[PDB]
Symmetry: C2
Subunit: 228 residues, 2 copies
């Protein structure tokens, strides 16, 4: 029995991202997995890190420090409920898939806000208790990303550099920092310019990969893997 | 007579970030520069890329494609006023300074949202205006970032990798892509653990740097600069 959370960041259900999300739901559901989707846009998920995220007395009301106050709020159980709702989904999951279009070599801001607000100290990491000792150890994560740029554009000698370069802040700085083991990314390059057959092939490749996802091992999430 | 825009992303005016922003305002104002600050949290700036960003008739009401719709809205002058207000500030500026704390090896979500929503096709880049030919060519950009981690953690073989590694999506994937020439980043490492005198040294380094900012040459914003 496995539990999967899909954190999904696209505005349009008929989009290529939406199709990739649905085939993940369909395939993991068919396998008998428990599946939950956080559809951030449909949830109107709040991306801003503000003092509204702490619902009780601040430890220092004179000078607001988001990190200090959210860590204390986590321990006291005074974080906003939208944050703890996401934390419950993550805590229960064996695998967290992030499904998103690449925006500025990174995640859409709504998804960046989920990272900023959900992965607070005490929940996702502690100091000490990060990278291999992070608090989400034992869990897997996987980035399923779509791009405008082609695969050739995302090579070492291409104008955008290798695709693994833009994965570093997400895979290493975020997921590995929190103790996740990271499965190899699923990058669906340039669906907007792919042919109809090429798009269907990309959707089928993801569905096929998910059939055997539980047999995969994580990547070595190191500088060498990303930069060689 | 130079014009500067500071895009500032911190919740607390008394923070180290707030102080770096105020030193920049004071010093650039003293030089006789024209200075504008976009204080994103005070503006409650919207980070989400949604259909509310277009005020006109959608080019395709059946299927929402954020990039297509914003490109068309830019051309038809029907973007939301919060976006067009920011575009005016950028259009007028000779230098754009981004002042932020590092969140998950990147910008806080509110600032990511400014990038996502302000830098639309037609305004910041197009086919074929990108990288050196980007539409904001002629302008300078500078990242002034504060970190939790120490300089030693941000080395090639340190736990976090070189700081240049996390700069790639921001400096290259975003600023260079839009045609900015990128001035060397200002990285203020670990002010929360630094001594009083170290903090003062880091602020003064920034104030002093700002005295000669117009004499600087841009970095070569290449994969080699970042990873080599
Ligand atoms: C703010 C912003 C920043 C960006 N920054 C970057 C960047 O830094 N680097 C980069 O490379 N790109 C960037 N892009 C481009 C972006 O990554 C792509 O536009 C996006 O990944 C395309 O995915 P989509 O789901 O929106 O595609 P869609 O336009 O929804 O899909 C493309 C086509 O596939 C079709 N389709 C949907 N489902 C199926 C299916 N099941 N089978 C067959 N076809 C199907 C759709 O109908 C459509 O015709 C950026 C875009 C924006 C808006
Ligand atoms: C969601 C989140 C994600 C994060 N991700 C990362 C990450 O990926 N990598 C990483 O390294 N860090 C990360 N951090 C830590 C973050 O980058 C630092 O906490 C932030 O950079 C500290 O800057 P600050 O302005 O908030 O410091 P502050 O705590 O406001 O300032 C530090 C000290 O300097 C003092 N000070 C202010 N002005 C002056 C002045 N004029 N002269 C002397 N002292 C002054 C303050 O009073 C304070 O005592 C993260 C934090 C959060 C909340
Ligand atoms: C670093 O490479 C980028 C950076 C920003 C980008 C893009 C690519 C990119 O391909 C697109 C984009 C947008 N805003 C920022 N970016 C909108 C859409 C876009 N790609 C789709 C357009 N086209 C011509 C494929 O249909
Ligand atoms: C990739 O390195 C990280 C990633 C996330 C981090 C931090 C460092 C970091 O130093 C902090 C942090 C927070 N949320 C995510 N992160 C809150 C505060 C924090 N700052 C460290 C110093 N200390 C112990 C004063 O909080
Ligand atoms: Zn790693
Ligand atoms: Zn570059």
């Amino acid at each position: 029995g496995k539990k999967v959370l899909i954190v999904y960041a696209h505005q349009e259900p008929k989009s290529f991202n939406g199709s990739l999300k649905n085939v993940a739901v369909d395939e993991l559901s068919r396998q008998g997995c428990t599946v939950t989707v956080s559809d951030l846009y449909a949830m109107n998920f709040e991306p801003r890190a503000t003092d509204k995220d702490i619902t009780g007395t601040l430890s220092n009301p004179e000078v607001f420090n988001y990190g200090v106050e959210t860590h204390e709020a986590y321990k006291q159980r005074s974080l906003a409920s939208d944050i703890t709702d996401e934390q419950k989904k993550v805590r229960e999951a064996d695998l967290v898939i992030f499904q998103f279009p690449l925006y500025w070599f990174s995640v859409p801001a709504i998804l960046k806000g989920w990272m900023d607000r959900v992965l607070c100290q005490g929940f996702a990491f502690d100091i000490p208790g990060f990278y291999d000792s992070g608090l989400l150890q034992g869990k897997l994560a996987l980035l399923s990303v779509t791009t405008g740029g082609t695969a050739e554009m995302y090579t070492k000698t291409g104008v955008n550099g290798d695709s693994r370069y833009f994965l570093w802040p997400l895979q290493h700085g975020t997921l590995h920092f929190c103790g996740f083991k990271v499965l190899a990314p699923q990058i669906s390059f340039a669906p907007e310019i792919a042919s109809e057959e090429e798009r269907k092939g990309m959707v089928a490749a993801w569905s096929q990969r998910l059939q055997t996802i539980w047999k995969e091992e994580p990547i070595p999430c190191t500088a060498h893997w990303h930069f060689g």
